[PDB]
Design a protein around this ligand. Sequence first.
Ligand code: CLA
Ligand code: CLA
Ligand code: CLA
Ligand code: CLA
Ligand code: CLA
Ligand code: CLA
Ligand SMILES: CC1=C(/C=C/C(C)=C/C=C/C(C)=C/C=C/C=C(C)/C=C/C=C(C)/C=C/C2=C(C)CCCC2(C)C)C(C)(C)CCC1
Ligand SMILES: CC1=C(/C=C/C(C)=C/C=C/C(C)=C/C=C/C=C(C)/C=C/C=C(C)/C=C/C2=C(C)CCCC2(C)C)C(C)(C)CCC1
Ligand SMILES: CC1=C(/C=C/C(C)=C/C=C/C(C)=C/C=C/C=C(C)/C=C/C=C(C)/C=C/C2=C(C)CCCC2(C)C)C(C)(C)CCC1
Ligand SMILES: CCCCCCCCCCCCO[C@@H]1O[C@H](CO)[C@@H](O[C@H]2O[C@H](CO)[C@@H](O)[C@H](O)[C@H]2O)[C@H](O)[C@H]1O
Ligand SMILES: [Cl-]
Ligand SMILES: [Cl-]
Ligand SMILES: [Cl-]
Ligand SMILES: [Fe+2]
Lengths: 342, 334, 451, 81, 137, 38
Amino acid sequence: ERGWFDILDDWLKRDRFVFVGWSGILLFPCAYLALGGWLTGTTFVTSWYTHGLASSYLEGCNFLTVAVSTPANSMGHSLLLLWGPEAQGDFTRWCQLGGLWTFIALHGAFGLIGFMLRQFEIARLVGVRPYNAIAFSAPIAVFVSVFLIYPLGQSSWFFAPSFGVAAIFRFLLFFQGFHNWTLNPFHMMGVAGVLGGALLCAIHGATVENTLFQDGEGASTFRAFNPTQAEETYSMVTANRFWSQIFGIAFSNKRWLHFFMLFVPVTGLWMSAIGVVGLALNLRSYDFISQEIRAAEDPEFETFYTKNLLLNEGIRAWMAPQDQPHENFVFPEEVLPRGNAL
Amino acid sequence: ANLWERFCNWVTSTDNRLYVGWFGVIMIPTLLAATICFVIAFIAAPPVDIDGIREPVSGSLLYGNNIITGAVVPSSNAIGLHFYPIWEAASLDEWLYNGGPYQLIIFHFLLGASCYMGRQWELSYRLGMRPWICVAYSAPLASAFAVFLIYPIGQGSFSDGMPLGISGTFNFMIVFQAEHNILMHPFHQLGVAGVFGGALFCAMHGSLVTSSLIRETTETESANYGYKFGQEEETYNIVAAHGYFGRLIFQYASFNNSRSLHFFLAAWPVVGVWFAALGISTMAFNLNGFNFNHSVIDAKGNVINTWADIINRANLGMEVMHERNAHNFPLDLA
Amino acid sequence: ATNRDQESSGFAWWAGNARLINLSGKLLGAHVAHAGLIVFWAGAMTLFELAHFIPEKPMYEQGLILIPHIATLGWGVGPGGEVVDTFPFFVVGVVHLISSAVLGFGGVYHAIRGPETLEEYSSFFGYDWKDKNKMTTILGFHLIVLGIGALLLVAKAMFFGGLYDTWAPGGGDVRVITNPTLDPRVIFGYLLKSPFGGEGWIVSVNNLEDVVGGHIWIGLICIAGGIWHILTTPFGWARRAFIWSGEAYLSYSLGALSMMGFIATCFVWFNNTVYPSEFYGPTGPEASQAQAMTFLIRDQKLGANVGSAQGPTGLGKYLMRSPTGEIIFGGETMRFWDFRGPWLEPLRGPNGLDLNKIKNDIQPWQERRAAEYMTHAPLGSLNSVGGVATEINSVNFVSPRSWLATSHFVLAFFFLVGHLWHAGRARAAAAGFEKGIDRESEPVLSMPSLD
Amino acid sequence: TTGERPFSDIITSVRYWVIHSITIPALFIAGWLFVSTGLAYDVFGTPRPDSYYAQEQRSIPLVTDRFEAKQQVETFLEQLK
Amino acid sequence: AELTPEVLTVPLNSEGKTITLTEKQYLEGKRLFQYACASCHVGGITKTNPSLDLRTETLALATPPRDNIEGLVDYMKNPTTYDGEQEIAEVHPSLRSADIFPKMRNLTEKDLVAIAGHILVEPKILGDKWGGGKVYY
Amino acid sequence: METLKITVYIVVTFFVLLFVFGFLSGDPARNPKRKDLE
Ligand code: CLA
Ligand code: CLA
Ligand code: CLA
Ligand code: CLA
Ligand code: CLA
Ligand code: CLA
Ligand SMILES: CC1=C(/C=C/C(C)=C/C=C/C(C)=C/C=C/C=C(C)/C=C/C=C(C)/C=C/C2=C(C)CCCC2(C)C)C(C)(C)CCC1
Ligand SMILES: CC1=C(/C=C/C(C)=C/C=C/C(C)=C/C=C/C=C(C)/C=C/C=C(C)/C=C/C2=C(C)CCCC2(C)C)C(C)(C)CCC1
Ligand SMILES: CC1=C(/C=C/C(C)=C/C=C/C(C)=C/C=C/C=C(C)/C=C/C=C(C)/C=C/C2=C(C)CCCC2(C)C)C(C)(C)CCC1
Ligand SMILES: CCCCCCCCCCCCO[C@@H]1O[C@H](CO)[C@@H](O[C@H]2O[C@H](CO)[C@@H](O)[C@H](O)[C@H]2O)[C@H](O)[C@H]1O
Ligand SMILES: [Cl-]
Ligand SMILES: [Cl-]
Ligand SMILES: [Cl-]
Ligand SMILES: [Fe+2]
């Protein structure tokens, strides 16, 4: 068996500086177009006709404020293809209608698929187990739930996150004010997985570096390691005693330790994804009913929970007219919620 | 050996199930006091006039809270930074109304946790280890100091310290955003790179090591039984893990040195969290996030909004609503 | 290239300066050159500030931090802190800049041309870190130098023009101090004050007599201590308490400097005596109080009875009681009632703010000052947009009090981190395991199991 | 190594710089002119500072119909006189 | 939209005469207003007394009228309360009180005209934002 | 309250004194290798 397919497979799997692979055929153009689309938009392209915002270096934005913004709410969930019925093949109009947003979201999605396929392909060639790809399932679930499922549940792509620093900050604040997203136990598990993962990263790196064996004469200890060496470079036994005596418990099994390092942040991200799927439908953890019944009846009952809801109400009333221009909100001064003086 | 020597030997002993040590001598009573007060208060404390306007906020389970809404509530704005121990109050009922437990707990806790850091140094010394795990722990510790002590000092009141509760924590974050535009501050941004990055590298390292485990078991048993505590040989093949990751990106983007790799795993989240802490600690003195409100203007002079201005509208909502009965004059100056 | 690579020195390039630990000549060079960098910055930055200085605008509207330091000493200013002569600032700048050339010259010489070690060249200048007596002697020389410095401040205050006194009778002005506080009950009294609200430890120093007398005490103490350390060698208990090595001494100094940094942060944030609001802008507390004052004045002009006006919460809208009964300003500024400043004190009686004085005695200059301070509160963005976080672009302002406080918190924090790093390392190296665990002598392997 | 010439070799060679001392500034100048001639505005349809609003108008030209969005944009553009 | 001569044409006095400012005059006006006035009057409001703003309509109802160049220049020389009843130079920046408001010391007549021109032109650009406060940000 | 204050002061002083005298009791030598750090 040495036909054109096998010859191609040979070329695709050459050991070169940048490995290609069959997965490369999907991954390279899609990742390139997504990145190039973002750079192109943030440098040159407005959001005047979709959002009423300037969004590019060309208009005077900086790195923090540039974005490729979502299409107008009136576009619905249009794929907004360049040759589609909205832009009708007109590149300029396509940019003005927000076509770069779906360009980037879709090429980005297919590129992420390509990258996970790359993780599988390389693992298979090299003869290792595919846990890196498996762990990548968490980035996939986040991207798909946030940039795709979420706006698909809402009225249109307009409410997806826009690709920009400040734009993303706005997304966070929208979620606080409208969804009370910090109250959601799926977000809370996400937070624990992220902060716990960061904790594990720090503590494991630090522990290894402070239980090193002296394997050289240098006071800078990095050179006293050889990639081909059979011996552990640090003492698990000493590490175990230290942590047992400091914290009460300690790892004793290195395999379990590293598995756990995969488990914690990967599971956290998956949990946050589930919460966002509910938010696509406005299925929020917004309230505690018992709290509201009590507070409604008793004007002296106050908790941090009720205090945060008043903040959410402020966010909604003060941000909506400019953040949701298609609604044509006109909120007269007298109806705006405000405490004393401010 | 005299009694003082014997005592010293026991205190500093490497054979105790939990290490005590001189830092531990301060750590143990202080943490016990903060813990016991916290538990009792979280369950049973009456409402606390956090903002000094005779508007008591209920934080305890027995007074209408669940786990998510419950908190130990910061001491009164009328107190400010004044030291308010039990013995400064005419009565326990007074002490509780004014938020005395918050101060007792945060002070004992900050002292105890500082001592926890010292104790990590100390045990490392008793065992012949290198000393810097405690430096790693300085990052979360500095963060605690920032929200419980430095922010209050800068703003002039422990009423603005982070509440000891889940929803209270969220409250602290939202008001902080209204007042300092923390999302647009580069130190918080480095913080986020620090924790996202930490989680990423945690997963990455976990996955690479797990992927290169050397076969030592059968299909019907956990692969974890392939490692035995204290065995001299490494349990995974770093050469294979590096062959993999090096081909995933390119060769020179991957670590071949386990020591450099682990130092990176330490340094990335620790440094990023150091900046997170410094963010809060400097916004404590009102050096705030970037302000690009109305930065973009057209030829006539019309304001052209950017995403920064939408952020600004959100922040205005938070600002005008927070502590709705506490401001009498137009500017919220702390 | 003696000791200038990782193989000979044991230290990688990124820790290259550790290669200098036992090379006293070159290390002397590093130190002198660094001093040159500091003095350089002081001079250059002073000339930069002066070039960018408009005399009729307040200093704090102009991003100045050094000119305020000079003016506080009484140079260049008159009544109310008005600039009457910029020449002193010019002089301080130029002389520092010129001196930096000298220091840099010495530093470069010792660092790349002079003797690499000093010991064979001179018993006096040479040293062993582990030689306790030599260490205490050099420590002594330096203590005497510091003491002389403190006394130089005393001399400025008492014999060479005085200091700017925000508290001078009739309004702030430069004043000669003729009766420095010498009473140790007062001087060390500050040292025993709580650091919490209404006390504020040494940060509470509120008059120049105390500042000057305090510096007399510090001068004499430093000279006496220096003599002590030249004439003595460390006692047994000290010898047994400390690690005696270069990295250890460094770690000690790092802890000391961290402490001083935190202190300076608080000083510049709260104190308005040795950091006059005329030059540095109002404190946070000051500006908050000033807003309350401003609206009390406005509403009372309109006819309000500010003593009896009940606010929405039941507390006085303008005036209320502190927890010990003193009459103070209301609203959120209830937190800041410990504030004291020359524009406010004339309205203060025995029981706090006095309603009669408020009704009858508020002068136009007090209204002005309160308006100025209220509208120069130390709030502003990283790109120097003045005001709260939601304020629009228009005013280019971040208070010098904020710049100074934030910079010194960051520096103090990282210096604490450095103290931990170098203290832990000095311990490990003195004990002999800073490079890692001896595989054939792992201490934990000789210990009984925990269970 | 995978066979390609080491980068450190390439970027320290004379010929590399004979080539790139031309190609790099040329690209940089091309991008400059893309902005400076105003071509970027026309390619991407980004408003010039005088083209966000007509003289007296203060309402955003928001797209409100999906399938005639193009013509709406064109109408918005005409109304800038 | 552009900053046209029409936008830059504002009332000189209360008798129907206009003056057309130059673009450079407009820039000078914005600069001088930030320099001497914005600390209290950012955005056309008044931080130390929010009841009184710099809206053109508000200025027209002042005594004497302050919705023209002459009125504004005079205000900067000899400010009064809103009803014209008291002179307030002692607590409000003016040339008359340049001694106690030192930032007024370098302001020339040309400068005052520029500031007045700024105050009159801005609302023609910004509308309700000018004098509007945070509600219109 | 006065009794509570006195008591707490005594307790705190006791523990601080333990800390200080403890670290003064030949601490550099309390390590597994080179003890003579004097
Ligand atoms: C190779 C990887 C790759 C992948 C997976 C994608 C995927 C996509 N591109 Mg991208 N694109 C790529 C490379 C890729 N692109 C490259 C290299 C360029 C530069 C030329 C582009 C330039 C580009 C532009 C300008 C646009 C896209 C768009 C899209 C989206 C719609 C595509 C579509 O409907 O095709 C439909 C075609 C197929 C699925 C081909 C299937 C062929 C079948 C199986 C064989 C039968 C064909 C038949 C015999 C032909 C008969 C024709 C006859 C009847 C007339 C989709 C996400 C659009 C978009 O993003 O909108 C937001 C869009 O506007 N792409
Ligand atoms: C305050 C900053 C500072 C200072 C004063 C020093 C000083 C020193 N370093 Mg260190 N170092 C520093 C920061 C500093 N370092 C930093 C940031 C790094 C990381 C990049 C290092 C990494 C490092 C390593 C790896 C090593 C040193 C070494 C040294 C010593 C000898 C250097 C030598 O032989 O140069 C030779 C250099 C030259 C001959 C070139 C010219 C150098 C001169 C001094 C520049 C003068 C310029 C100035 C403008 C002239 C003004 C003149 C005018 C006054 C008349 C010297 C005492 C070495 C050492 O310890 O030796 C035992 C050593 O191996 N350093
Ligand atoms: C004590 C330190 C200090 C303080 C408080 C100030 C304060 C000020 N400076 Mg000065 N200055 C300093 C040092 C300082 N400077 C130094 C070292 C230089 C030489 C570079 C200058 C040269 C200088 C010039 C030329 C100017 C100023 C100006 C100013 C004013 C505006 C500052 C600004 O906009 O910053 C912007 C904010 C930043 C640049 C952010 C810096 C963030 C740093 C990089 C973070 C670093 C963290 C930490 C140090 C790193 C640790 C690493 C960790 C891993 C261990 C403000 C009053 C301006 C002025 O108004 O003059 C009238 C002005 O034009 N300064
Ligand atoms: C940290 C300060 C310091 C110290 C401890 C030393 C120490 C030394 N220097 Mg170096 N040097 C320094 C800074 C320093 N130097 C500076 C700033 C310069 C530039 C002028 C030099 C330029 C220099 C040269 C060119 C040479 C030395 C030499 C020496 C060695 C012999 C010194 C001697 O015998 O003088 C004897 C002492 C005197 C003659 C009396 C000095 C009178 C002083 C300067 C009056 C002012 C004192 C007052 C406290 C100054 C305060 C300054 C403050 C504001 C910063 C000795 C190791 C020699 C050497 O190493 O040969 C191998 C040598 O040739 N030095
Ligand atoms: C006890 C030390 C001490 C303290 C508390 C002060 C305080 C002050 N000085 Mg003074 N000064 C000192 C020593 C001190 N100084 C010395 C040694 C010199 C000579 C260099 C000076 C020369 C000087 C000048 C020229 C000026 C001042 C000024 C000031 C005032 C403003 C500056 C500031 O915020 O510093 C804050 C102070 C600190 C952060 C230091 C805190 C010291 C702590 C409490 C002790 C540290 C001890 C150490 C770690 C222990 C060693 C170990 C031992 C136990 C064995 C402030 C009241 C300014 C002024 O008054 O303007 C009118 C001014 O212009 N000082
Ligand atoms: C930079 C300044 C400096 C430094 C680094 C030193 C360093 C030293 N001194 Mg010296 N000394 C100095 C200045 C200095 N001194 C001055 C200015 C004087 C005159 C007052 C003296 C008078 C002096 C005497 C009489 C003695 C020393 C001794 C010593 C040695 C041991 C000290 C010790 O154990 O500290 C640590 C301090 C202790 C162990 C004591 C109690 C520790 C508690 C916890 C202190 C709590 C302070 C706390 C932080 C609160 C701070 C605020 C508070 C002040 C309100 C050590 C070499 C001793 C020695 O061996 O001489 C040969 C000694 O007997 N010194
Ligand atoms: C869209 C589209 C497309 C594509 C395009 C592309 C592909 C593009 C690319 C593009 C690109 C590819 C661009 C690039 C850019 C870049 C840049 C713009 C850069 C910059 C940089 C900088 C600025 C730097 C910075 C920094 C950092 C980052 C860090 C360090 C520091 C510093 C600061 C240096 C097509 C045609 C297909 C179709 C249609 C549509
Ligand atoms: C060792 C070393 C180092 C360092 C070094 C250093 C750090 C040095 C320093 C140096 C210095 C520190 C220098 C300085 C100099 C200065 C000068 C040279 C000055 C001059 C001045 C002048 C000339 C002035 C003028 C004037 C006048 C008189 C008047 C007014 C105006 C003016 C300004 C024009 C390094 C890192 C590299 C590495 C290697 C080793
Ligand atoms: C000038 C002035 C003044 C005065 C000041 C003074 C007079 C100061 C003093 C100061 C002082 C008099 C300080 C002291 C300090 C001390 C210290 C800081 C100590 C430390 C210690 C240590 C660090 C130790 C450690 C340890 C332990 C604990 C255990 C054993 C081991 C060891 C040794 C490691 C006044 C305020 C009036 C006003 C303003 C001006
Ligand atoms: C206010 C707090 C108190 C401040 C006091 C500081 C003033 C300076 C005097 C400090 C005196 C230190 O006195 C210190 O005490 C202990 C107890 O006897 C001594 O004795 C210690 O020696 C050995 C050292 O190998 C220890 O193992 C042993 O447990 C202990 O007996 C120290 O060798 C001595 O140095
Ligand atoms: Cl709130
Ligand atoms: Cl208020
Ligand atoms: Cl109105
Ligand atoms: Fe590991």
